[PDB]
Amino acid sequence: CCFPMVYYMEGSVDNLDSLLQCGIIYADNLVVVDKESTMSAEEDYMADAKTIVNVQTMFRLFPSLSITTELTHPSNMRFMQFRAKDSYSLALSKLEKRERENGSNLAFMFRLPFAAGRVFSISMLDTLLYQSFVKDYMITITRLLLGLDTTPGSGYLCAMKITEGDLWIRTYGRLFQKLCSSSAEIPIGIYRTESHVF
Amino acid sequence: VTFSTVGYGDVTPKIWPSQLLVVIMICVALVVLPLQFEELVYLWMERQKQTEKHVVLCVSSLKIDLLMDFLNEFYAHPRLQDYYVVILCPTEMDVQVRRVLQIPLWSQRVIYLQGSALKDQDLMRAKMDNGEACFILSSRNEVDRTAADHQTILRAWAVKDFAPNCPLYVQILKPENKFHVKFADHVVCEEECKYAMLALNCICPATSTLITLLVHTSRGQEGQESPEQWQRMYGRCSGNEVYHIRMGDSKFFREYEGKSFTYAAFHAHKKYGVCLIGLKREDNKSILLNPGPRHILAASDTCFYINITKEENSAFIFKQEEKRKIAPVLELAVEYVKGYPPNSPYIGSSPTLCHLLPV
Amino acid sequence: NLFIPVFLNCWLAKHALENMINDFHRSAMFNQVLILFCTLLCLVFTGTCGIQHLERAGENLSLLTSFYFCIVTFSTVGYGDVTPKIWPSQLLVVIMICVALVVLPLQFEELVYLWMERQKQTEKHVVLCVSSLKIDLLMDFLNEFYAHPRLQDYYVVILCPTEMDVQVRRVLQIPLWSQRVIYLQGSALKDQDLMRAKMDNGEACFILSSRNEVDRTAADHQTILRAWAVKDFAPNCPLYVQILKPENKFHVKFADHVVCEEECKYAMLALNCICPATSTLITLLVHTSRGQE
Amino acid sequence: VTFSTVGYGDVTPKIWPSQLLVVIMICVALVVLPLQFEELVYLWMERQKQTEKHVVLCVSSLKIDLL
Ligand SMILES: COc1cc(-c2noc([C@H](C)NC(=O)c3cc(C(F)(F)F)nn3C)n2)ccn1
Ligand SMILES: COc1cc(-c2noc([C@H](C)NC(=O)c3cc(C(F)(F)F)nn3C)n2)ccn1
Ligand SMILES: COc1cc(-c2noc([C@H](C)NC(=O)c3cc(C(F)(F)F)nn3C)n2)ccn1
Ligand SMILES: [K+]
Ligand SMILES: [K+]
């Protein structure tokens, strides 16, 4: 009740009227969380079927909207934004198969929805828990990045937009130097954007 | 030799009574031994219904995906190649689990016991008292999540009661139950991390991808054969992991002792390509992400950095560096109120200074 | 120049070999039948060497004859042409038989244990991906498929996540359908089950909806996911999808041929109201028949 | 008679290659016949799953008291 501009409304992602009433024309993001009871299917990979189909329907209706989803199985992240009549999306399948041949755990990584940040799976949390057997600091680092735990004197994960006026900083190292010489910020990585007309 | 039905014939009865005795003896054997055989197979049918440094995985219902995730994440480390996994599951083994466990690679590494952590007998069958780690995992497939959380809390309590000196790695679904297993060595809350990552994706795009590729062990060899440059670079940078090493022993940061944290981080990135994200002072137990320019490095600090490979394993790049032979950073330095939310919904919720309505 | 029974070292060779297999493959039941064969070979080796050397004093038999004697007594045959006639050769045969009769049943028990644990073609094939296979649906598919002379050489792979029904078993161990129908227990959403069915070289994939399911939208979602998975895995495999509800018909529009159950059913009912027995006309027009009824 | 593992021994090879032939043939039988036996028992397991004036009782679920 004390948070500003936080509203609720009854509805679902499968009915268009509720999304239009909440306002999806003006929605920057649409976060969809899977239902708890949807995982009752005997076929384990079919637990995400309803969520995937609903998100695909919303993606077809609103192509420019940014939808973020959480899936139970990492093998279903290929289905988030499914373009069947697309050569690149099916060559990514061959790339994933080639990576999986070499014993790669991150075979899902080359899928476009995952790379763009549209979908993640909670299996990364299990991987984090198993990693903590070797890296006891990993859970604390992850929580600090997410802001889940707040220790005084600890930084937070922010993001800065590289505009056309900042391209005189031609290099990532020069940007690192400028940030450490002006605001003492440490850049983790880059969220890169390319034109990939389908 | 006539027992085994060989019948050499070198020595053979040649009289009436001995031939009769052989005959009756053969009959008695062939009538009395199949009874013993049928009793033995009856008992066999009723009966049908290693090394040190092992790890126990206590779950409620084991699936092929969860098991494969655990095996891939566990046996990707060279130090844990000799470890074998004991799986305590109250349910019977699934067919796919059987198919993966009769693979020769996983045949002797994975031991599956059908039992419960709340029974001490199943706990000593798994040898928890000498186990290296117990992984209590929540059942995300269960419709009722509070019941699953209660079951995981009871499993953690039972393991702590039985084997107190066994580090616990508990996975909790709902944050309200996160303070019941606070005694555990490492607790991961599903909802907290999931929703925080979703919120950050709303704030910083593809934060979930960053965390997923940072907590996954990988050599950074993915997509190196691709003709697309973006795939090559993306799969190379996905091999980065967060590593910790003492600052005095760290060949990356040792030369920057007594300098500012930002100066050290920038110059380490410029020289070797490591991203010093934070540190932990020896006096405190708190890890600080980017302490700032006012922080002065010390030889006893534990520096956390992002790099493709560990410093211990970066001997090849150190030997390559040996084979090699903007302002500058300085080595030393309706209106809304701001306050904490009034009613924290659960115990353990970290208080965060937030933008708040005046009333 | 004194006798030291070196021939017993084959037991240690077998022990080292079985210690080696436990780590490296070189394959689950083969690894243990290999140990069974090695145990048999070691037994025959020890036996023949023992009989030959101990009968060097009497019967002065060669190693070839000793090997022949040991193998013919191995099969419990006992010809009697060459037989030990001295005290310790006879006793060695006795202990050798007892040792075999105690060791080999253990190997047999291990083999049958592994066998119980293990219990739980041509080109131009067609894959039938269903959710639950019944006898009527399978018979309909077989009758409609194999009524064409061009598809006589085709065989059918059935991908079903459930276990084979009893009636399906009775029809599939018929000799006519024994080698034509392959039943794989798996899901199209797992790529391993897709390569087991060899979808990449398949001629056609038939995704069929579960009309028996109470919730039809869930079944339609499952069929949409199956079609998407097959397209992702084998893009050059024509899809024949069967959709229950018309709302979900535009998610599988990429498929080669899509049939909507509700649309066709209600259109045929409406035409029966307009043109009587239109459904009969369509049913007899889409059924392959020689007209001999 | 050597098939049944009987081995009378009245007629028996006395020369080297006939002896090696019976040896190899015994080995071949003991290695090739168990495959037929395992196939037969496999098919038997898969297979596991009068007079005139008779009367048919068509029920939905048969219990002991009704029968
Ligand atoms: C072939 O694989 C086998 C066979 C048997 C076996 N079961 O019954 C017999 C015969 C009928 N009986 C005999 O050999 C026999 C005769 C005599 C005696 F002369 F009275 F002293 N004592 N015995 C024990 N063989 C057991 C195990 N493994
Ligand atoms: C009948 O179908 C079979 C029987 C067996 C078998 N199991 O045990 C034996 C007997 C007890 N033992 C022998 O014959 C024997 C004796 C000797 C030796 F003299 F020491 F050299 N070496 N052997 C191998 N037969 C196995 C397979 N198929
Ligand atoms: C005991 O109950 C049985 C045993 C068998 C059987 N299986 O293998 C064998 C032996 C190893 N082999 C032989 O006897 C043998 C030798 C020869 C030949 F000399 F080459 F001509 N031809 N044969 C067939 N017995 C089968 C059925 N019932
Ligand atoms: K990584
Ligand atoms: K790495």
Q: 3-state SS of A31-50?
A: EECCCCHHHHCCCHHHHHHH
Q: How is residue B247 written in tokens? A: 């600052």
This PDB structure is determined at a resolution in Å of: 2.9
Angle between helices D16-47 and C63-74 (to 10 degrees): 20
B280 has which bridge partners? B287, B302
C147-169 burial, b at 16+ Cβ within 10 Å, e below that, comes to eeeeeeebbbbbbbbeeebeebb
Cβ count near A22 (within 10 Å): 14
Cβ count near B36 (within 10 Å): 9
Q: Is C105 left (phi over 0), alpha (psi -120 to 50) or beta?
A: alpha
Q: Are C189 and A43 in contact (CB under 8 A)?
A: yes
Using a CB-CB distance cutoff of 8 angstroms, which residues of chain C are in contact with residue B9? 78, 80, 83
Q: How far apart are the C-alpha atoms of A66 and A178, rounded to whole Å?
A: 31
Q: How is residue A12 written in tokens? A: 């679902």
According to DSSP, residue C149 is labeled G
Q: How far apart are the C-alpha atoms of B119 and B162, rounded to whole Å?
A: 10
Q: How far apart are the C-alpha atoms of B153 and B310, rounded to whole Å?
A: 35
B114 has which bridge partners? B89
Q: Which residue of C has its CA nearest to D21?
A: C68
Q: How far is C247 from chain A (nearest CA, A)?
A: 10
Helices (H) and strands (E) in chain C, counts: 11, 6
Q: How far apart are the C-alpha atoms of B334 and D50, rounded to whole Å?
A: 94
HSE-CB at C261 with a 13 A cutoff on CA atoms is 15
Strands B287-289 and B275-280: antiparallel
B134 has which bridge partners? B56, B168
Find the A112 Cα to ligand 2 centroid distance in Å.
Answer: 65
Query: Which residues between 44 and 73 in chain B have a beta carbon less than 8 angstroms from any beta carbon of chain A?
Result: 55, 63-66, 69-70, 72-73
Q: How far apart are the C-alpha atoms of C230 and B329, rounded to whole Å?
A: 55
Is the Cβ of C25 closer than 8 Å to some Cβ of chain B? yes
End-to-end CA distance of chain B: 101
Sign of CA dihedral A11, A14, A15, A17: positive
Q: Are B206 and A115 in contact (CB under 8 A)?
A: yes
CA angle centred on D16, ends D11 and D20, rounded to 5°: 85
Sign of CA dihedral C104, C106, C110, C112: positive
End-to-end CA distance of chain C: 94
CA angle centred on B51, ends B50 and B52, rounded to 5°: 135
Is the Cβ of D30 closer than 8 Å to some Cβ of chain B? no
Q: Could you give the C-alpha distances from C276 to C82, C228, C270, C273, C280, in angstroms and in order?
A: 93, 39, 10, 6, 9
Q: How far apart are the C-alpha atoms of C146 and B37, rounded to whole Å?
A: 51
Is the Cβ of D49 closer than 8 Å to some Cβ of chain C? yes
Q: How far apart are the C-alpha atoms of A95 and A76, rounded to whole Å?
A: 16
Q: Find, among C130, C191, C190, C122, the residue nearest to C165 by Cα.
A: C130
Nearest CA to ligand 1 atom 11: B26
Which candidate from B3, B48, B98 shows the least CB-CB separation from C120? B98
Q: How far apart are the C-alpha atoms of C166 and D46, rounded to whole Å?
A: 10
Report helix, strand and coil shares of chain D as percent, to nearest 5. Answer: 50, 0, 50
Q: How far apart are the C-alpha atoms of C132 and C163, rounded to whole Å?
A: 9
| Cα B85 from chain centre | 10
Q: How is residue C230 written in tokens? A: 């097959």
Residue located via tokens 């009775």: C170
> What is the count of residue pairs from B and D with beta carbons less than 8 Å apart?
5
Q: Find, among B254, B356, B295, the residue nearest to A154 by Cα.
A: B295
DSSP C181-227: EEEEE--TTSHHHHHHTT-TT-S-EEE---TT-S-HHHHHHHHHHHH
Q: Are C77 and B6 in contact (CB under 8 A)?
A: yes
Is the Cβ of D44 closer than 8 Å to some Cβ of chain C? no
Q: Find, among A172, A178, A171, the residue nearest to B262 by Cα.
A: A178
Q: How far is D20 from chain C (nearest CA, A)?
A: 7
CB contact (8 A) between residue B5 and residue D9: no
Strands B275-280 and B241-246: unpaired
Q: How is residue C193 written in tokens? A: 């089950």
Quote the longest CA-to-CA distance of chain A.
57
Q: Are C70 and C64 in contact (CB under 8 A)?
A: no
D46-60 burial, b at 16+ Cβ within 10 Å, e below that, comes to eeeeeeeeeeeeeee
Find the B193 Cα to ligand 4 centroid distance in Å.
Answer: 18
Using a CB-CB distance cutoff of 8 angstroms, which residues of chain B are in contact with residue C120? 95, 98
Is the Cβ of C79 closer than 8 Å to some Cβ of chain D? yes
Q: How is residue A117 written in tokens? A: 């940040």
CA dihedral C69, C74, C76, C78 (to 10 degrees): 0
B326-338 burial, b at 16+ Cβ within 10 Å, e below that, comes to eeebeeeeeeeee
According to DSSP, residue B260 is labeled B
Q: How far apart are the C-alpha atoms of C180 and C156, rounded to whole Å?
A: 6
Q: How is residue C226 written in tokens? A: 């199956």
Residue located via tokens 């540190």: B279
C9 has which bridge partners? none
DSSP A86-133: -HHHHHHHHHHHHHHHTT-S--GGGSHHHHTTSEEETHHHHHHHHHTT
Q: How far apart are the C-alpha atoms of B133 and B79, rounded to whole Å?
A: 14
Q: How far apart are the C-alpha atoms of C95 and C89, rounded to whole Å?
A: 10
C157 has which bridge partners? C127, C182
Q: How far apart are the C-alpha atoms of C166 and C135, rounded to whole Å?
A: 9
DSSP C52-63: HHHTTTTT---H
Using a CB-CB distance cutoff of 8 angstroms, which residues of chain D are in contact with residue B9? 9
Q: How far apart are the C-alpha atoms of C68 and C139, rounded to whole Å?
A: 57
Residue located via tokens 């001995």: B18
In the three-class reduction of DSSP (H, G, I as helix; E, B as strand; rest coil), residue C140 is classed as helix
Rg (CA), chain A: 20
Angle between helices C63-74 and C87-118 (to 10 degrees): 50
Q: How is residue C290 written in tokens? A: 């020689």
According to DSSP, residue B296 is labeled B
Cβ count near B293 (within 10 Å): 19
Find the B8 Cα to ligand 4 centroid distance in Å.
Answer: 72
Q: How far apart are the C-alpha atoms of A195 and B159, rounded to whole Å?
A: 54
According to DSSP, residue B116 is labeled -
Nearest CA to ligand 1 atom 24: B3
Cβ count near C20 (within 10 Å): 10
Q: Do the chains A and D touch each other, judged by at least 3 C-beta pairs below 8 angstroms?
A: no
Residue type, C68: Y
Q: For chain B, where are the E strands, in sequence order?
A: 54-58, 84-89, 110-114, 134-136, 168-172, 186-189, 241-246, 275-280, 287-289, 302-307, 337-339, 354-356
Residue located via tokens 């097959």: C230
Q: Are B78 and B52 in contact (CB under 8 A)?
A: no
Rg (CA), chain D: 26
Q: How is residue B140 written in tokens? A: 């995300």
- Residues with Cβ < 8 Å from C234, sequence gap 6 or more? C194, C199, C200, C202, C205
Q: What are the φ/ψ torsions at residue A54 (nearest 5 degrees)?
A: -65, -45
Q: Are C138 and C168 in contact (CB under 8 A)?
A: yes
Rg (CA), chain B: 32
Q: How far apart are the C-alpha atoms of B298 and B278, rounded to whole Å?
A: 13
B305 has which bridge partners? B243, B276
- Residues with Cβ < 8 Å from C61, sequence gap 6 or more? C51, C52, C55, C69, C82
Q: Which helix (H) or strand (E) holds A67?
A: strand A66-71
Q: Are D27 and C71 in contact (CB under 8 A)?
A: yes
Which candidate from C64, C65, C80 shows the least CB-CB separation from D9? C80
Sign of CA dihedral C94, C100, C105, C108: negative
Q: How far apart are the C-alpha atoms of C221 and C219, rounded to whole Å?
A: 5
Pocket of ligand 1 (CB under 6 A): B 2-5, 22, 25-26, 29-30, 33; C 76
Angle between helices B207-214 and A123-131 (to 10 degrees): 40
Q: Is B130 annotated as a binding residue?
A: no
Strands B302-307 and B275-280: antiparallel
Q: How far apart are the C-alpha atoms of C205 and A192, rounded to whole Å?
A: 38
Q: Which helix (H) or strand (E) holds C160?
A: strand C155-160
CA angle centred on A109, ends A108 and A114, rounded to 5°: 95
Q: Find, among C195, C209, C179, C289, the residue nearest to C237 by Cα.
A: C195
CB contact (8 A) between residue B190 and residue A191: no
Q: Could you give the C-alpha distances from B267 to A172, B24, B255, B260, in angstroms and in order?
A: 13, 98, 10, 11
Q: What are the φ/ψ torsions at residue C241 (nearest 5 degrees)?
A: -100, 145
* Residue of C11, C36, C55, C97 best suited for mutating to test ligand 2, as the one with most atoms within 8 Å of CB: C97
Q: How far apart are the C-alpha atoms of D17 and D20, rounded to whole Å?
A: 5
Q: How far apart are the C-alpha atoms of D62 and C200, rounded to whole Å?
A: 49
End-to-end CA distance of chain D: 53
Residue type, B167: P
Q: Are C151 and C145 in contact (CB under 8 A)?
A: yes
The neighbours of chain D, by the rule of 3 or more Cβ pairs under 8 Å, are B, C
Q: How far apart are the C-alpha atoms of C186 and C176, rounded to whole Å?
A: 24
Is the Cβ of C95 closer than 8 Å to some Cβ of chain B? no
Burial class (CB in 10 A: 0-12, 13-18, 19+), B164: exposed
Cβ count near A24 (within 10 Å): 17
Q: Which ligand is nearest to the CA of B215?
A: 4
Q: How is residue B109 written in tokens? A: 């590494």
Residue located via tokens 């070979």: C41
Q: How far apart are the C-alpha atoms of D22 and D30, rounded to whole Å?
A: 12
Q: Find, among A135, A153, A146, A188, the residue nearest to B286 by Cα.
A: A153
Q: In terms of residues, how long is chain A?
A: 198
Q: Which helix (H) or strand (E) holds C281?
A: helix C278-285
Q: How far apart are the C-alpha atoms of C55 and C60, rounded to whole Å?
A: 6
Q: Are B66 and B137 in contact (CB under 8 A)?
A: yes
In the three-class reduction of DSSP (H, G, I as helix; E, B as strand; rest coil), residue A12 is classed as coil
Q: How far is A112 from chain C (nearest CA, A)?
A: 14
Q: Are C172 and C163 in contact (CB under 8 A)?
A: no
The neighbours of chain C, by the rule of 3 or more Cβ pairs under 8 Å, are A, B, D
Residue type, B58: C
Q: Which residue of C has its CA nearest to B109?
A: C23
Q: Find, among C162, B193, C233, the residue nearest to A124 by Cα.
A: B193
- Residues with Cβ < 8 Å from A41, sequence gap 6 or more? A47, A49, C218, C222
CA dihedral D36, D40, D45, D51 (to 10 degrees): 180
The neighbours of chain B, by the rule of 3 or more Cβ pairs under 8 Å, are A, C, D
